[PDB]
Design a protein around this nucleic acid. Structure first.
Length: 962
RNA sequence: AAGAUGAGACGCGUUUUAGAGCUAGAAAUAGCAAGUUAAAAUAAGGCUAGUCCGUUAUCAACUUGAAAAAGUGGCACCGAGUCGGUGCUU
DNA sequence: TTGTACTGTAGCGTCTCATC
DNA sequence: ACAGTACAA
């Protein structure tokens, strides 16, 4: 009748248990299915469900944002092509066609292999005239001559494809900048600012830095490149030209952070500085060649030809980084003389720089706007079409999705929240007139802020909400905005006004929700007639933070008791805090509860995260048709040590199930304060139904490194048309699940229709096409007449029973895993962990040394366990000469101290432990790696379907198939 | 303090192609010159065709069910190489 | 021509917004 | 876990 459930919850495992009152796990005879001759199995009512750890959604988020990024960038290019198509179809209609076909090989291209001009001599002349695109950019900015439309489009597409960061919020012209010494303009309205930077900053540090410079009639008589005006301290206050000089000096110091020198009068200082970089690289390469030919001709072959030895050829043609190439070439220029300028340029990281470099991420989008506005102002008179819609392309650079608007979905996304005012295709030119920025912006903040735990229909209150603030002031008086909005109202009595204070809630609601100037203005529109213009243009600055955790016993409410103070099963669980791994664990635990109540005739049993877990599992008693107890590990460990069965992870998966058992034992014992003689036998049975959960593998298709072209057939076609023979592709695809098939395949030059039984490994993208039509897909892979009703679906950790109890765990269609665990007597483990790890078992009183002198007789087990590994490895691992290796290494180091050999037998049990084979050393040397590539040996085995508890099986004998 | 989700952006990398290599060469190969950039893609792709979605989560098997979802399997004892048997029961 | 033994392979770094 | 090379038939 009566029984209890033991449970533990973890990232990867859910141990489960069944205990009748005197600490005894029952043992019962069960029923199986399938075509096997077995019809009754015996298993103890104890087990552990092991599964892969849950993944966080962060990687999918970074990928999803990346996909949206590339999509919108391609759309920007598409818009610019849409603009230029009408005019440049006159000069070259296939120009965009060649641009899109530039990836293809010469035969695959539908036009000439030279994209920019479609002929060799013009393309060569262009490349000679403009060594980089930046030469074209600078030429188009500076020269007033009429340009080819094609070069204009290259400049514009390069501009918008890499349009720079948007951290700089205002408009800006680049020619305002000057050397760090520009602070002389602040003086007349020293050392560069970097000596003052990278230090402590505060209001007092600001004060002392300003006072350390010379005072005068002005705030400083000499400003000494001080901190406060150049650097923002750690439209508002516009009601207050030192400010303008401070602003311009800040623009100067930023533009010196990005750009070096801008002497020559040009509107494209970025292109100028980078052409300076290019020309320096040219001159230094020529000097390098001359010096290496003069001094060291033998390393000339290594450096300038070998792409593998991290030379300059490795730096350009190979994948060498700038830092690694610098650290390679630095000793070469150190021991060889005449390269002091080379060393000082290397120490400045300005030596042989490329154009497209990882450090370009500091440049703002206003620089590209200045260059782009400049080229349109240059070419407007030659091409009136540019003058027709100049602001459109300018907008394409400046346009951005606002961070509060979200994805521009027509109600089909699972993340989007935008609210269009019209059913129009959103363009950068008409974004704000279509999208209701108001509803979308308020939807951003409301959809993510929580409801009250007592009232789940409405949002929690702001911390500074006004009638809530008066309620909280009343609460504090019985048991800040009163002193704050006194300033804005300029009266305390009208702050104490009561009648019209619900709208007064709604202003502070607005200023707690929104941050944007125009948005606060548009939502403050409602209160225009109550106040004058100056006071509400000052009031819109009152940005609020914080949300209060509330809503708007003998019959007492929570407030009255405070006067004497002293649904979806998925979504109710998934919404909690904590890692996604423990959420997967508790979902498995809920399924464990459902199965454990299903099995026994529907008989019910008798930190902050698990506090939530206890309530959510106690909800079951009235939601889904069991006293939920908060256990502690202390008495569990005390019972383990006192009754001489110590907790161990290194041997086997076994003690997680014994921990679930002892969890139920301690819970029943504390609700209750023979069985003490029962517990040591209960941990002593070697049959516990351990269930490795079986999952289809989801994730990326492959390792992401696109491997170069090859003649192999295992390259993955990264596009449909892109044949991976020529274009390169991915390797190491990830298996989804194995599919056992029985069919016939023709083999040999004289082909014969020979029957076959083998398992194919499906992968993630063809999983959809496989499940759409398995027979036609399997036909396409080559199999004739696959037996449709015998297609068996075999995901990872599918389990197979072979002869003499040997079990193997399916890793993939080309790889197995070990499926068996050994089980020592408990006295062996007691001897081991009293010998091994003194420092983390001892420190308890002298009974620890008493049980040490109970296990001193067990030194013979340092041989006997080697006999156990030999026996079990010959039985179910079949390790062949590796057994000879470990036995030999054992035999030469038996005479070592007990502690260290005990630790090293702990190190050997990585052989016998469940799952993958892994190397180990014992004392001396590493065992060579092994892999069970043979999936052949399970084709005649007995397949095991194991339930979530594993209690309910369906065994299939594969040899009876086909 | 300690971390979880979602939105907007940037810059590299990778791959293929374009950037005419020259001389001595039957040739094998040797000497020499050049090298900095661009285009396209960045999960195959999907249809509700959106400037949206595609790596998070769910999932033993079987019978129903497009799916969702529901259903499908005895007890007592003694032993224990991973569970075995006995007897009762219909 | 089809299976085993052995060693080698693996996309990445910033920035801005909101809360539990 | 899968690849690539190097051998046993």
């Amino acid at each position: 009748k009566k029984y209890s459930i033991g449970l533990d919850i973890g990232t990867n495992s859910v141990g489960w248990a069944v205990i009748t009152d005197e600490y005894k796990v029952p043992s019962k005879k069960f029923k199986v299915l399938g075509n096997t001759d077995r019809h009754s199995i015996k298993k103890n009512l104890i087990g552990a469900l092991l599964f892969d750890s849950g993944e966080t959604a962060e990687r999918t988020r970074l990928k999803r944002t990346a996909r949206r990024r590339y999509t919108r960038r391609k759309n920007r290019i598409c818009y610019l092509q849409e603009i230029f198509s009408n005019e440049m179809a006159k000069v070259d209609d296939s120009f965009f066609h060649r641009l899109e076909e530039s990836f293809l090989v010469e035969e695959d291209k539908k036009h000439e292999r030279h994209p920019i001009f479609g002929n060799i001599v013009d393309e060569v002349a262009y490349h000679e005239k403009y060594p980089t695109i930046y030469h074209l950019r600078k030429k188009l900015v500076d020269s007033t001559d009429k340009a080819d439309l094609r070069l204009i489009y290259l400049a514009l597409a390069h501009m918008i494809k890499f349009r720079g960061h948007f951290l700089i919020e205002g408009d800006l012209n680049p020619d305002n900048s000057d050397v760090d010494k520009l602070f002389i303009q602040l003086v007349q309205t020293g050392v560069d600012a970097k000596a003052i930077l990278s230090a402590r900053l505060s209001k007092s540090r600001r004060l002392e830095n300003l006072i350390a410079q010379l005072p005068g009639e002005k705030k400083n008589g000499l400003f000494g490149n001080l901190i406060a005006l150049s650097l923002g301290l750690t439209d508002d206050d516009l009601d207050n030209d030192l400010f303008l000089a401070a602003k311009n000096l800040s623009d100067a110091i930023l533009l010196s952070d990005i750009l070096r020198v801008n002497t020559e009068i040009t509107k494209a200082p970025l292109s100028a500085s980078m052409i300076k970089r290019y020309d320096e690289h040219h001159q230094d390469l020529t000097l390098l060649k001359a010096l290496v030919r003069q001094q060291l001709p033998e390393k000339y072959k290594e450096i300038f030809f070998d792409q593998s030895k991290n030379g300059y050829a490795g730096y350009i043609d190979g994948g060498a980084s700038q830092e690694e190439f610098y650290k390679f070439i630095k000793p070469i220029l150190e021991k060889m003389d005449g390269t002091e300028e080379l060393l000082v340029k290397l120490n400045r990281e300005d030596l042989l720089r490329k154009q497209r470099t990882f450090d370009n991420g500091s440049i703002p989008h206003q620089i590209h706007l200045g260059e782009l506005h400049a080229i349109l102002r240059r070419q407007e008179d030659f091409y009136p079409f540019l003058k027709d819609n100049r602001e459109k392309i300018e907008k394409i650079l400046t346009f951005r999705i606002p961070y509060y608007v979200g994805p521009l979905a027509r109600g089909n996304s699972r993340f989007a929240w935008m609210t269009r005012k019209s059913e129009e295709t959103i363009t950068p030119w008409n974004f704000e007139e279509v999208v209701d920025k108001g509803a979308s912006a308020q939807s951003f903040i409301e959809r993510m802020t929580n409801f009250d735990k007592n009232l789940p229909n409405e949002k929690v209150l702001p911390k500074h909400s006004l009638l809530y603030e008066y309620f909280t002031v009343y609460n504090e008086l019985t048991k800040g905005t009163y002193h704050d909005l006194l300033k804005i109202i300029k009266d305390k009595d009208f702050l104490d006004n009561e009648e019209n204070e619900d709208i007064l809630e709604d202003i502070v609601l607005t200023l707690t929700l929104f941050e944007d100037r125009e948005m606060i203005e548009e939502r403050l529109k409602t209160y225009a007639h109550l106040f004058d213009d100056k006071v509400m243009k000052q009031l819109k600055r009152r940005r609020y933070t914080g949300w209060g955790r509330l809503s708007r016993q003998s019959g007492k409410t929570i407030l009255d008791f405070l006067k004497s103070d002293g649904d979806s099963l998925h979504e109710h669980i998934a919404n909690l805090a904590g890692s996604p791994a423990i959420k997967k664990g508790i979902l498995q635990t809920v399924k464990v509860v459902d199965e454990l109540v299903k099995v026994m005739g529907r008989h019910k049993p008798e930190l902050v995260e698990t506090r939530q877990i206890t309530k959510h599992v106690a909800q079951i008693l009235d939601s889904r048709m069991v006293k939920v107890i908060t256990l502690k590990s202390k008495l569990v460990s005390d019972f383990r040590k006192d009754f001489q069965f110590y907790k161990v992870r290194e041997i086997n998966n076994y003690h997680h199930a014994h921990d679930a058992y002892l969890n139920a034992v301690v819970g029943t014992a504390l609700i209750k304060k023979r069985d003490f003689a029962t517990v040591r036998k209960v941990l002593s049975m070697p049959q516990v139904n351990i269930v490795k959960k079986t999952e289809v593998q989801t994730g990326g298709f492959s390792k992401e490194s696109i491997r170069p072209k090859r003649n192999s057939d295992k390259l993955i076609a990264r596009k449909k048309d892109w044949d991976p023979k020529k274009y390169g592709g991915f390797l190491w695809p990830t298996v989804a699940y194995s599919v056992l098939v029985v069919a016939k395949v023709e083999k040999g030059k004289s082909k014969k229709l020979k029957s076959v039984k083998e398992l194919l490994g499906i992968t993630i993208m063809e999983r959809s096409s496989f499940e759409k039509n398995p027979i036609d897909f399997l036909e396409a892979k080559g199999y004739k007449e696959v037996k449709k009703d015998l297609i068996i679906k075999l995901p990872k950790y599918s389990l197979f029973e072979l002869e003499n109890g040997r079990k193997r765990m399916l890793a993939s269609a080309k790889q197995l895993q070990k499926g068996n665990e050994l089980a020592l007597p408990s006295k062996y483990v007691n001897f081991l962990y009293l010998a091994s790890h003194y420092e983390k078992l001892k420190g308890s009183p002298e009974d620890n040394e008493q049980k040490q002198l109970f296990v001193e007789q067990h030194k013979h087990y340092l041989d006997e366990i080697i006999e156990q590994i030999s026996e079990f490895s010959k039985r179910v691992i079949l390790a062949d000469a590796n057994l000879d290796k470990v036995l030999s290494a054992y035999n030469k180091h038996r005479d070592k101290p007990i502690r260290e050999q005990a630790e090293n037998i702990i190190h050997l049990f990585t052989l016998t432990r469940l799952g993958a084979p892994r190397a180990f050393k014992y004392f001396d040397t590493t065992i060579d790696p092994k892999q069970y590539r043979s999936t052949k040996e399970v084709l005649d085995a007995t397949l095991i379907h194991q339930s979530i508890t594993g209690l309910y099986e369906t065994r299939i004998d594969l040899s009876q198939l086909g």
